[PDB]
Design a protein around this ligand. Structure first.
Ligand code: NA
Ligand code: NA
Ligand code: NA
Ligand code: NA
Ligand code: NA
Ligand code: NA
Lengths: 332, 332, 332, 332
């Protein structure tokens, strides 16, 4: 099967699986898992932060992050198209009692500080209390301008707002920046990391920040049901991932750059390509048609007027060459 | 002194007070207040709706309407600048567990239906469940196009969405249209009426809609603490207003257009005026000095880079004339 | 028309109505209402507290009280039959995301302190964070022992918990104690006052406490929809009542005492008599019968196996003399 | 290392680790994981229910169960000492806006049905809407009488209440009953199964019920953050444990009874023994000393004046013999 729907579809490697069946464990609720504790310490260490907390999914990572930054009645300025605003069913509001304030992102995927400023609420009882600024790095594959990251940090310190970055794909961003994770993590109060997507873990995400902050996050994770027991067997894949699956995202980047090339030259209307994603304007009259085609041929994609193809460790250039072929076929 | 911060400042007239002191009361929680019952019945019948409920304020009116329409986890599409998203401290989200989907209204005060449609969430566990479309007639003075009021209603029926209209100033819209309330209210499942502003009442709002819908509103009204006792006395002022202070709203609208032309001649930069409101481009430099200047001369106005002047029954043209004079001499 | 259902049915005296009509008013959202300001300033001073806030109802006074005391995730220990746990539809939990921890009260109406200590949750991530102890003075007529009021105050100072008192009928308790209000209010962090019951106003309650605590309350009041405009009309009723209607509460007490004896000798099974209330065991077999019987005689009571009769300024001894006569007849 | 803290400390056996590694997996959010699907189908049929859903923890299992049964403003009657009320930080009230109505459980572990009846709120606006009755079978080791299980079911059928059973240790009960699971789950609308406790799994729980009920459960599971990706690996242990670690549960019961007799002869005051649990009255004086004394001998226990010792598949009788030996010596 050729799965191009998302990078979430990545399956454990032999080496990753061996690391899991071997890793030592304990009861994480009790704080006994050595492997879970080593993954937390590692990550915090790597980003220049005090602590880290392992989570079931990136969704919870974000739900807990927001609950930890904002109190009942506070607000977070976020993207109109951000995951922790749109793709998490409004958990922040529904469950967290936090007021979401969405605004459109600029083309490069950043949230214009000028527009952000206009949304910060006066200290007036008619308004929700603006507390946090939430960014998403590698927003739909888009890499935020490094310098932007620094401005957003300075801007929030001046206005006493917290800055949180949803880094479900922050490593695709580090590889593209060609820098140290620390170099960018230094410009945010807290951030997340998904291990189950490009990094290739079966499950898992991390929440990184200061100790006190992460201390509240533990409570919120417990209430939301994310505190597992012998989770070390899962965190084992997580360390393996961090230590061996990061550089290789460059291969995924190269592959989607290659794919865009094939399709452009194959008639396809390539709208853009960023890191490990590329978009094609398929049209409405073919959205479902192209999906069927590709599916009948063991190629999975999410059919729609604008199709998002995503690369990861479970799809080669050979496999891409085939999708290219079929796509060209379809158009003829 | 001259109050132009808002029409919420209007005070009870002699005749209105007499109606209040003479009103027959009961215990509204038991449902024994005849005058409260009367106000609610009049309003319902007047708009072609089955029921109506009396609330302490317009804010609770909307809070109760949004809770009555949306379940925990449902979402409402609303204006980024609409009172029930922005000016109510995020109550829908915070207190009701409802996900808000704000979008920018068009220049005429309408929420573009093409934009609304794009914000309607697919039936996917990743999204909040879109359930209601909230409108506001007379949005910052702006009277919504009547034809709009019909497409909106049609649009929501075709897409199984409730439609609620925040009518704090719905009568300024009605007086402006030159039609009966029924003609525009026929186009909504539920709407709201504010008695404490233009209509001169000291307190009070009405939430109007279907019988079964208003029945839930009572539970939510009790809970949010708005179920009062011998409130018929307050409801009394509502009857007096609905029957005597609707027509003269026209007096407010004329006093506003005339003031817009006077501030122009005085060199001030009038940005626009709609019904009982106008906004002047003051600037960050004079913003705070101007409110001070006006306050020292007995003119209360909400000082701000852009100044909104609101006219109502406690502010005459003579008084307005003097404000034009002060404004002119302030620019010297 | 003898109304014995509750003291909420009390109606405005002539002296009261006149004051109301005369009260100067303003816009309370702007804080421009002299009467409201005057009301809040008297209640605070009379109790030796810093500030006070006027609310539409007692339910909202307690809901705001609880919001201002407990953050999302915190907890309040309370009585199983207490009004802010059982009788406000659980808004504290439903609206404010507060965990309620009820225990049963002793016969005297107090919450056994050894029982409260047993419910104070350990600082562990499995538990909600106990923060406040809520008492109810004059709990179904019952006057809490004064010593217990001090003991509970010392108990909460010791275990660092906030202490709030629902004082809907706190004046019934004060008049029973025979002391000044400040002598018992000095034993709580915040307390409420209902003006619409024994004190007999049409509307109103007050939440009283430290100025910063009350500042949060103002915010919660706006969000819950209790931010009225020209509410000085209602607040004047409040001042009048605190000036003229406190002392007479002794009259309703003596009337209850009287009535209880009568029903006793008439062969009625009077279960308990406290301040302005008395309960009678009537039975499942007479519940309906009695209510109807009394209704045909213009006597309003809440029928049930156990009838609660409440006395107030609108029930004279002479009328009670009638009721006892009918009840006797009823039992014959 | 002897661990008697809980049965949550069980770790994977070699056979269970092989199952996990060999398990075919897919993406669970898309519904492509064959092992998760099988785990869920299996539990459904074994219990007589239409659907089942795998969650990361027994807590999320109950939060989602609660949210799926009670809408905003509704309420569940539950045990004062129940896990979904006491040990889950109040998530039901905090996140779900659901009002809890706890009550003391009888000595045998059941919630007196007659007690439950007095807590079902009349349909009146002052009260929250009673919707669900929640039980916990094997409540602190206590096996609820089967007659009770049937009675509660009928009672709830008559009163039209949903009945949910928290079954984190439902197999301990099944084995004590000597009946098939189906014979007890036939008496509830929904129930959970914990895999990571006595059953020996690393992580995981199940929530079983109707297909509609579970469909909403999938929505809440996503918002709360339990929608993992390739969780088939985790779920494989689940099938293994359900097919192999159920009957051996009797051994833990026998060991537990046996140990209790050892500790008695050793001079300890054993208060109670049920299924795989037993309690010792150690005393506030020896609690800390005891925990340490054992710790020094590689025996982990949760010290307290009353020590709960839990037996599981990772503690044999030989080890229990060692432990009683240290205890006899401690006492001396
Ligand atoms: Na994966
Ligand atoms: Na007014
Ligand atoms: Na909420
Ligand atoms: Na809540
Ligand atoms: Na009254
Ligand atoms: Na385990």
């Amino acid at each position: 099967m050729i799965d191009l729907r998302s990078d979430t579809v990545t399956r454990p490697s032999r080496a990753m699986l061996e690391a899991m069946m071997a890793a030592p464990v304990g009861d994480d609720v009790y704080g006994d898992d050595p492997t879970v504790n080593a993954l937390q310490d590692y990550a915090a260490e790597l980003s220049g932060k005090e602590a880290a907390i392992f989570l079931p999914t990136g969704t919870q990572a974000n739900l807990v992050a927001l609950l930890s930054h904002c109190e009942r009645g506070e607000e977070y300025i976020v993207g109109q198209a951000a995951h922790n605003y749109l793709f998490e069913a409004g958990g922040a509001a529904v469950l967290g009692s936090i007021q979401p304030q969405p605004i459109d992102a600029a083309a490069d995927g950043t949230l214009p500080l000028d527009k952000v400023a206009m949304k910060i609420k006066p200290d007036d009882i008619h308004f929700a209390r603006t507390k946090l600024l939430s960014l998403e790095n590698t927003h739909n594959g888009k890499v935020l301008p490094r310098e932007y990251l620094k401005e957003a940090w300075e801007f929030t310190r001046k206005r006493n707002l917290a800055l949180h970055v949803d880094g479900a794909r922050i490593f695709n961003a580090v590889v593209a920046y060609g820098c140290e994770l620390k170099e960018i993590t230094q410009y945010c109060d807290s951030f997340t990391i998904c291990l189950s997507k490009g990094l290739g873990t079966p499950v898992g995400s991390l929440l990184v920040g200061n100790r006190d902050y992460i201390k509240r996050a533990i409570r919120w994770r417990k209430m939301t049901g994310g505190g597992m027991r012998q989770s070390g067997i899962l965190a084992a894949a997580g360390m393996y991932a961090l230590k061996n699956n990061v550089a290789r995202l460059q291969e995924d980047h190269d592959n989607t750059a290659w794919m865009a090339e094939q399709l452009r030259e194959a008639g396809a209307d390539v709208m853009r390509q960023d890191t490990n994603m590329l978009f094609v304007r398929v049209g409405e009259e073919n959205a479902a048609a192209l999906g069927e085609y590709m599916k009948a041929r063991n190629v999975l994609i999410n059919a729609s007027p604008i199709v998002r193809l995503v690369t990861h460790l479970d799809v080669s250039r050979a496999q891409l060459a085939e999708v290219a072929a079929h796509w060209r076929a379809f158009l003829a």
